[PDB]
CSV table of N, CA and C in Angstrom, one decimal:
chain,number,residue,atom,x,y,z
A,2,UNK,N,-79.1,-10.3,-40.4
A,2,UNK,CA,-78.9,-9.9,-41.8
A,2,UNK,C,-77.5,-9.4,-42.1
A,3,UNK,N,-77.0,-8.5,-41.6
A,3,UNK,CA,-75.5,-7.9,-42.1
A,3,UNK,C,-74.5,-8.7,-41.4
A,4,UNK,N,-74.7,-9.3,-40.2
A,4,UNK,CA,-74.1,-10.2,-39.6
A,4,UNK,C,-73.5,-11.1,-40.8
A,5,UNK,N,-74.6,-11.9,-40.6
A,5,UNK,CA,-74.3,-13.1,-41.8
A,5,UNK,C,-73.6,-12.6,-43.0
A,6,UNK,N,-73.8,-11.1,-43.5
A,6,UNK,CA,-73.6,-10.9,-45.0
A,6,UNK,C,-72.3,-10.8,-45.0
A,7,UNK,N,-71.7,-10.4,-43.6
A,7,UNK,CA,-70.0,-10.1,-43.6
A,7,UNK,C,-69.2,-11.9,-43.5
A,8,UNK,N,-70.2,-12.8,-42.7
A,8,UNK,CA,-69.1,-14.0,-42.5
A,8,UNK,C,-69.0,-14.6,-44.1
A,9,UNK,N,-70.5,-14.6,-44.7
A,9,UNK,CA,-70.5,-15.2,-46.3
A,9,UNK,C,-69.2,-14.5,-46.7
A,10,UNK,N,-69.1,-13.1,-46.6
A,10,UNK,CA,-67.9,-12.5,-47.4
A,10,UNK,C,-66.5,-13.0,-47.0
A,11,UNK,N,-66.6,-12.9,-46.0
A,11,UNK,CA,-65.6,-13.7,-45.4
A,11,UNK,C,-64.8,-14.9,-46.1
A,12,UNK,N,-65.9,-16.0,-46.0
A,12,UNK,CA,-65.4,-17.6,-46.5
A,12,UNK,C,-65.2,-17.1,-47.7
A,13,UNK,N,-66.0,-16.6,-48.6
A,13,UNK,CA,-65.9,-16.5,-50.3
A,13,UNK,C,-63.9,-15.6,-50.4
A,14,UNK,N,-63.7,-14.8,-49.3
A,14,UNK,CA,-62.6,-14.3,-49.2
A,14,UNK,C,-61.9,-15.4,-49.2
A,15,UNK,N,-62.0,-16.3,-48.1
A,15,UNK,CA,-60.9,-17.2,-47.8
A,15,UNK,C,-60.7,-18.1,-49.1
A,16,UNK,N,-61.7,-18.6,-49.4
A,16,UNK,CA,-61.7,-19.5,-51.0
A,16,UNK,C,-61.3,-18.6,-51.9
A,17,UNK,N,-61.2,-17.4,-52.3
A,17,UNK,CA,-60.2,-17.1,-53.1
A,17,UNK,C,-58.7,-16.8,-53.1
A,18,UNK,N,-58.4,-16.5,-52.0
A,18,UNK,CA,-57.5,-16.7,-51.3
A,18,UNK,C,-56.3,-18.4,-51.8
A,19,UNK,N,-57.3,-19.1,-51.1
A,19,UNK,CA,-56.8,-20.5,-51.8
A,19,UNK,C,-56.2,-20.8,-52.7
A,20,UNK,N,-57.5,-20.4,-53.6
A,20,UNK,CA,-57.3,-21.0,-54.8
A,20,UNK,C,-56.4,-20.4,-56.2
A,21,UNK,N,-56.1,-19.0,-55.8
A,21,UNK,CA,-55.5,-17.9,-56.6
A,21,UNK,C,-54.0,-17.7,-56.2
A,22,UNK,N,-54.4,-18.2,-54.7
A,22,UNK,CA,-53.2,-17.6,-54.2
A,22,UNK,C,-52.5,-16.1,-54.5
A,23,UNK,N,-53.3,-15.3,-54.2
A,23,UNK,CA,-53.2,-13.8,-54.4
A,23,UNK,C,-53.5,-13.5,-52.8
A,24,UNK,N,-52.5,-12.6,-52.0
A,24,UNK,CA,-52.3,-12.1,-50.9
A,24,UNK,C,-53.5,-11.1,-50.6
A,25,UNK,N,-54.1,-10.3,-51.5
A,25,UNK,CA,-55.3,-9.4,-51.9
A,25,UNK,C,-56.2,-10.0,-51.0
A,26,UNK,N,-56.6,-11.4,-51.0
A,26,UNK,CA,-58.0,-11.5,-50.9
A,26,UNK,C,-57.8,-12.1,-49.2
A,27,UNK,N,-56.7,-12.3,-49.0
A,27,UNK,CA,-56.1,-12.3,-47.7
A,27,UNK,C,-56.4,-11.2,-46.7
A,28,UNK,N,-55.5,-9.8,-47.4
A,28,UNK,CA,-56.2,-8.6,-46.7
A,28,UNK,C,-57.7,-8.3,-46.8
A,29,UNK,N,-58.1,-8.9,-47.5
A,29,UNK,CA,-59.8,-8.7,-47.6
A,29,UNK,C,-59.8,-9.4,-46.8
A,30,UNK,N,-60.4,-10.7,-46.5
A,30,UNK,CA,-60.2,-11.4,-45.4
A,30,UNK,C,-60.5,-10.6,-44.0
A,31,UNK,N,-59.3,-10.0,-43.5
A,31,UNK,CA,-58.7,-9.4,-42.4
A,31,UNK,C,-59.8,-8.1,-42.1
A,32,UNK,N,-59.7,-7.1,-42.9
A,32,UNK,CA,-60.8,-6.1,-43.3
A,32,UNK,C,-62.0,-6.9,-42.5
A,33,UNK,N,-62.6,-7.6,-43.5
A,33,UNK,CA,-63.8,-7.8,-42.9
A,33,UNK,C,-64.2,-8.3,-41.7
A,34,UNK,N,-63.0,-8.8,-41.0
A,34,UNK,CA,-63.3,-9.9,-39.5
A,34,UNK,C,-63.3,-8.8,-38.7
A,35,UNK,N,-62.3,-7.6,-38.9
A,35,UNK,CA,-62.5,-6.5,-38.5
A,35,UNK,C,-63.6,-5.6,-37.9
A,36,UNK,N,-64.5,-5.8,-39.2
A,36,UNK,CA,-65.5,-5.1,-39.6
A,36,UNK,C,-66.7,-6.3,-38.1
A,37,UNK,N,-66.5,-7.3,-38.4
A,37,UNK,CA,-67.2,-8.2,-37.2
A,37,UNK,C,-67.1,-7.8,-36.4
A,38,UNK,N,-65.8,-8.1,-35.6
A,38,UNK,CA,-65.3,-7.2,-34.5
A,38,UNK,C,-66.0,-6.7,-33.5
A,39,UNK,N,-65.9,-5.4,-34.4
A,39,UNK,CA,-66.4,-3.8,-34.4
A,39,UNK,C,-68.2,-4.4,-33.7
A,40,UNK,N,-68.9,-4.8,-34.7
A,40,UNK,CA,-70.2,-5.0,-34.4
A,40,UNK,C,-70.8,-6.0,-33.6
A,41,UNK,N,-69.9,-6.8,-33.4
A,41,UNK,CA,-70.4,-8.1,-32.2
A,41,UNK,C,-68.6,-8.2,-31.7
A,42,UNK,N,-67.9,-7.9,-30.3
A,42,UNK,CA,-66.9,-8.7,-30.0
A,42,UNK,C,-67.3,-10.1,-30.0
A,43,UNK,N,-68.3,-10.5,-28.9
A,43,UNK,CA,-68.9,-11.6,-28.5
A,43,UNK,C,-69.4,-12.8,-29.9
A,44,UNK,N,-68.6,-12.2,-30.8
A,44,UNK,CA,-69.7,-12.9,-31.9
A,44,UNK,C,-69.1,-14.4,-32.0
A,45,UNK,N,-69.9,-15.9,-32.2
A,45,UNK,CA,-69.3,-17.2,-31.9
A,45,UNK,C,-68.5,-17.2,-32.8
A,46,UNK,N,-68.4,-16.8,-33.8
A,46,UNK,CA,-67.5,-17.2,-35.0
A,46,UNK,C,-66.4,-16.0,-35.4
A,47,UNK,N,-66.1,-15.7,-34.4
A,47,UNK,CA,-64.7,-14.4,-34.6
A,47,UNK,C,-63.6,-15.5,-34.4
A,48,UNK,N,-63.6,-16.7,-33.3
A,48,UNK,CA,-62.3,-17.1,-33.3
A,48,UNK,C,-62.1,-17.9,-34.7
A,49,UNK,N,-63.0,-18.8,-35.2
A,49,UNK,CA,-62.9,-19.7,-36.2
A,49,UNK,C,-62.5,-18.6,-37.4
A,50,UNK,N,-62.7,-17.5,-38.0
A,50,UNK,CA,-62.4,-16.7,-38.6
A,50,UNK,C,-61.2,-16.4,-38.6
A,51,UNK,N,-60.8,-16.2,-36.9
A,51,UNK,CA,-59.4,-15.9,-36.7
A,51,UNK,C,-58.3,-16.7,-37.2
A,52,UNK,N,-58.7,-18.1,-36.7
A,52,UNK,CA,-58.0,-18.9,-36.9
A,52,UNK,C,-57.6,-19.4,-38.6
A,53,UNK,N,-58.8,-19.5,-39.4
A,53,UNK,CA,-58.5,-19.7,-40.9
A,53,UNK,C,-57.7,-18.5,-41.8
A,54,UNK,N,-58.0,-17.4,-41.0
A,54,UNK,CA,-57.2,-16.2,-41.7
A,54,UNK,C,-55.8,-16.9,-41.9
A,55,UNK,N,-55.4,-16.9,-40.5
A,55,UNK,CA,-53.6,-17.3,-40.0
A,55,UNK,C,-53.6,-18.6,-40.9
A,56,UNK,N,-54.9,-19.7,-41.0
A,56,UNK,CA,-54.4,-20.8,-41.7
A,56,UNK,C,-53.9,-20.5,-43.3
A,57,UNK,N,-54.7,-19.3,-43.9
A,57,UNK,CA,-54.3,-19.3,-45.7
A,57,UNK,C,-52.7,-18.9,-45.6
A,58,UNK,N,-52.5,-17.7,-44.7
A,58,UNK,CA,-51.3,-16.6,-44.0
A,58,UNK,C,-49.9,-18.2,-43.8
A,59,UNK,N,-50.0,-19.0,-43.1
A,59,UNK,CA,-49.1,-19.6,-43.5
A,59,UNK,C,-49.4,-20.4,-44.8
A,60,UNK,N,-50.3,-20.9,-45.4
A,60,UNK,CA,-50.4,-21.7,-46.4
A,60,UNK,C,-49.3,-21.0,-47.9
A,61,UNK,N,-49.3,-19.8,-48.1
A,61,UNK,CA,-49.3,-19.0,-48.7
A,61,UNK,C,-47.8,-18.6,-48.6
A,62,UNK,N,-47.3,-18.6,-47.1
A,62,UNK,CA,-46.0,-18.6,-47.1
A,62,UNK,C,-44.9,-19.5,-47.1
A,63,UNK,N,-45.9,-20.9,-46.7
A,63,UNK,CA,-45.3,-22.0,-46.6
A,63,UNK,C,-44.6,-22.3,-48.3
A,64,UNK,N,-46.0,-21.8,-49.4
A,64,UNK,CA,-46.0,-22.2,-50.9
A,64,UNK,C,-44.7,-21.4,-51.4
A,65,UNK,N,-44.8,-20.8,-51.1
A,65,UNK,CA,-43.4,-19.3,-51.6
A,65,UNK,C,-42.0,-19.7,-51.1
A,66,UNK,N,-42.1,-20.1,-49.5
A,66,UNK,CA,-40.8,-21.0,-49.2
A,66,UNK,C,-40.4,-22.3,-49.7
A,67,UNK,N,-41.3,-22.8,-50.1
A,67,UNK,CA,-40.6,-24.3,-51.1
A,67,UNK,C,-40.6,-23.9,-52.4
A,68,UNK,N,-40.7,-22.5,-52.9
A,68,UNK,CA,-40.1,-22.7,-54.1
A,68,UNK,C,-38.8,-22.2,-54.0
A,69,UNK,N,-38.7,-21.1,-53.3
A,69,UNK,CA,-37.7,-20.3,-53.1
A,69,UNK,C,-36.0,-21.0,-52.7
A,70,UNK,N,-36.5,-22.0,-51.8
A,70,UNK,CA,-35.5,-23.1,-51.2
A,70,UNK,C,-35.3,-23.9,-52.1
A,71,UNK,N,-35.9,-24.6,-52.9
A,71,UNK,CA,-35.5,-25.7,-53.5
A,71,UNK,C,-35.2,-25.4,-54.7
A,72,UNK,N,-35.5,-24.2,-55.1
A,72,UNK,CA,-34.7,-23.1,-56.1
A,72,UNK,C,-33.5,-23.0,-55.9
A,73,UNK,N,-33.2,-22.6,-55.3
A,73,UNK,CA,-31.6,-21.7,-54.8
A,73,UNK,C,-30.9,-23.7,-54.5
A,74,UNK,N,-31.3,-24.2,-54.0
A,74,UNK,CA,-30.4,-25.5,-53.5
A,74,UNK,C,-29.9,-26.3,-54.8
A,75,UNK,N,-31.5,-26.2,-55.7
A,75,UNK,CA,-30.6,-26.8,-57.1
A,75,UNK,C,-30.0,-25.9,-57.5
A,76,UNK,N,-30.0,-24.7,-57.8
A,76,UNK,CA,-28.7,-23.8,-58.4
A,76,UNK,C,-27.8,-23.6,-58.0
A,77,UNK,N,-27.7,-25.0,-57.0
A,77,UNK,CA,-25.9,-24.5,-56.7
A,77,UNK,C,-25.9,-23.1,-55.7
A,78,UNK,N,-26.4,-23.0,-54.7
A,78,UNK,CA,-26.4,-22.0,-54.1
A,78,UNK,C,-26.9,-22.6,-52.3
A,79,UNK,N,-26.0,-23.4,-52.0
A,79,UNK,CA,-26.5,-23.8,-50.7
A,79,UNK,C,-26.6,-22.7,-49.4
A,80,UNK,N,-25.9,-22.2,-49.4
A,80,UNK,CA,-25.5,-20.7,-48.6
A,80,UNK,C,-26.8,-19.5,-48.6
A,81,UNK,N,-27.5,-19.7,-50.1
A,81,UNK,CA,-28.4,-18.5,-50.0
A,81,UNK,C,-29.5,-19.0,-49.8
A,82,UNK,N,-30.1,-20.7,-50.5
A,82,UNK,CA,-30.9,-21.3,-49.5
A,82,UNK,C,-31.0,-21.6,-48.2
A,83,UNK,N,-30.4,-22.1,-47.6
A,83,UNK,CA,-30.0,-21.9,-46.2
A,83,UNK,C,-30.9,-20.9,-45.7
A,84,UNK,N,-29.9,-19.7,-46.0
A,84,UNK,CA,-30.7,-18.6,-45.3
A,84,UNK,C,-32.0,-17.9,-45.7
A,85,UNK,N,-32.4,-18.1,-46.6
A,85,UNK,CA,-34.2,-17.9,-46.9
A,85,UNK,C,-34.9,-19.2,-46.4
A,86,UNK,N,-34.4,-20.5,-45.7
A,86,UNK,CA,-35.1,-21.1,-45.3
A,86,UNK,C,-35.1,-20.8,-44.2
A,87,UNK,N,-33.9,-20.0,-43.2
A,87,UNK,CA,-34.1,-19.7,-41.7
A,87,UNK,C,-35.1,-18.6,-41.6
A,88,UNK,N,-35.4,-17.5,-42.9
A,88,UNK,CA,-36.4,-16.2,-42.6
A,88,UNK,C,-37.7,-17.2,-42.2
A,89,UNK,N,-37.8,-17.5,-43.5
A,89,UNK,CA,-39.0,-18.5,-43.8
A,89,UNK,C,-39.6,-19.0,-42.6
A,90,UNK,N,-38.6,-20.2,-42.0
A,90,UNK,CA,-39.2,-20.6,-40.5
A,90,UNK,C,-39.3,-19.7,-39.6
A,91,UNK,N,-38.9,-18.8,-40.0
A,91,UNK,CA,-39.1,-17.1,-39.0
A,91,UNK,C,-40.4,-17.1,-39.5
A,92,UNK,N,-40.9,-16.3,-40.2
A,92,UNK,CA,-41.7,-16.2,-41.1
A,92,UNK,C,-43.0,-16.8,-40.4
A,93,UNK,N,-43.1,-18.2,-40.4
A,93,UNK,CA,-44.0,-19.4,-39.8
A,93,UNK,C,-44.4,-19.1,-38.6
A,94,UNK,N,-43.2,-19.3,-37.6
A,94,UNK,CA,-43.4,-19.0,-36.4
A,94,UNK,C,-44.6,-18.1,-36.0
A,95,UNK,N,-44.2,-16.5,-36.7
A,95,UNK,CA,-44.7,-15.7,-36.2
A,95,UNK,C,-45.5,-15.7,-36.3
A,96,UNK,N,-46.4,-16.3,-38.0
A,96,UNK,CA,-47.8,-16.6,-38.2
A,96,UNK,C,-48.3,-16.9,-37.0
A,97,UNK,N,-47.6,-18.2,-36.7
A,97,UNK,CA,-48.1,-19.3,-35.7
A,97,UNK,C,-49.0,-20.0,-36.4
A,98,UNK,N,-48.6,-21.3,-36.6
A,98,UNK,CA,-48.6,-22.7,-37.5
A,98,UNK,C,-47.4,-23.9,-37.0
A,99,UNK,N,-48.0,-24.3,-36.5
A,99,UNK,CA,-47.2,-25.5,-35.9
A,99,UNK,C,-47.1,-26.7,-37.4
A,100,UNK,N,-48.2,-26.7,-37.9
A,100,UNK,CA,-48.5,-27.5,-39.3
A,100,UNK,C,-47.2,-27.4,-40.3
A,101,UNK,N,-47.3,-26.0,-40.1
A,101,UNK,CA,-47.0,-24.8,-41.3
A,101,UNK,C,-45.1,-25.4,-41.1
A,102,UNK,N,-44.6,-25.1,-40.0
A,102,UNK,CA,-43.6,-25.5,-39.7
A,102,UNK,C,-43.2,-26.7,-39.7
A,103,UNK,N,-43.8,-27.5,-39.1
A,103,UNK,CA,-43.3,-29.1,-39.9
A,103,UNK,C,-43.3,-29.6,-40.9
A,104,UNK,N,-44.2,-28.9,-41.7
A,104,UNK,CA,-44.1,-29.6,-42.9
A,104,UNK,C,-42.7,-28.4,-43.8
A,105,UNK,N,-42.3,-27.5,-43.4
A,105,UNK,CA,-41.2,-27.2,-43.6
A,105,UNK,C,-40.1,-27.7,-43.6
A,106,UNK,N,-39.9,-28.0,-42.1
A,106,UNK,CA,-38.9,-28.8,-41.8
A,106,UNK,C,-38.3,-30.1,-42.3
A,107,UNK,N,-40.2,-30.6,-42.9
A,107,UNK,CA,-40.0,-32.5,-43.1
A,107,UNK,C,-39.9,-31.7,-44.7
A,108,UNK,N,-39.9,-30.6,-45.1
A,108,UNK,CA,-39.8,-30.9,-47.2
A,108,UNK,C,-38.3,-30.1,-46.7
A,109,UNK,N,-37.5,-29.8,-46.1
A,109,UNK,CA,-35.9,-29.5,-45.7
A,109,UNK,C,-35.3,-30.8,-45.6
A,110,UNK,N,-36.0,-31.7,-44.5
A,110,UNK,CA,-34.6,-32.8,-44.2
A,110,UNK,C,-35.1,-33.5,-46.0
A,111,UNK,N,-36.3,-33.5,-46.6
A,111,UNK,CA,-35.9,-34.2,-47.9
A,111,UNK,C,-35.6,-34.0,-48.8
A,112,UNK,N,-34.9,-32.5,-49.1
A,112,UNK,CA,-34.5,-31.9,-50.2
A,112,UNK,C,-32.7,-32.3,-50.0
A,113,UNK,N,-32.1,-32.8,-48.5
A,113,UNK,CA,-30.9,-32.6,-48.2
A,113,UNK,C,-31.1,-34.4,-48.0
């Protein structure tokens, strides 16, 4: 019963998340896998949980770095693009998103 009631909360987190793209429901998210944790380590679905967290976590930063870059590159500002694209792939890394990062890299070499 409460088991289930936190993973439902969970996904409905992650779908808003998505779709709003508001960081909020991200930390909610997190909160609640937490909350799993705590009550089952052993529980089957802590990794898959784990894993979609980090998936919205880059999704989210990946969206913010393509605007941020391809902002600054059309205004004539190659220097300050540049370098919010090197955080950024900082940024990725750390997530950990291999996805997250290529597809950075491939919307970089075609912006240049």
């Amino acid at each position: 019963s409460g088991k289930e009631e936190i993973k439902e909360a969970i996904k409905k987190a992650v779908v808003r998340a998505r779709v709003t793209g508001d960081p909020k429901y991200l930390e909610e998210a997190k909160a609640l896998l937490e909350k799993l944790k705590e009550l089952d380590e052993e529980d089957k679905d802590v990794e898959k949980f784990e894993k979609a967290i980090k998936q919205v976590e880059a999704e989210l930063t990946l969206k913010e770095a393509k605007e941020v870059v391809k902002r600054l590159f059309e205004e004539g500002r190659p220097e300050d693009a540049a370098r919010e694209a090197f955080e950024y792939l900082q940024k990725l890394l750390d997530i950990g998103s291999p996805e997250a990062v290529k597809e950075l890299l491939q919307f970089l070499r075609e912006l240049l």
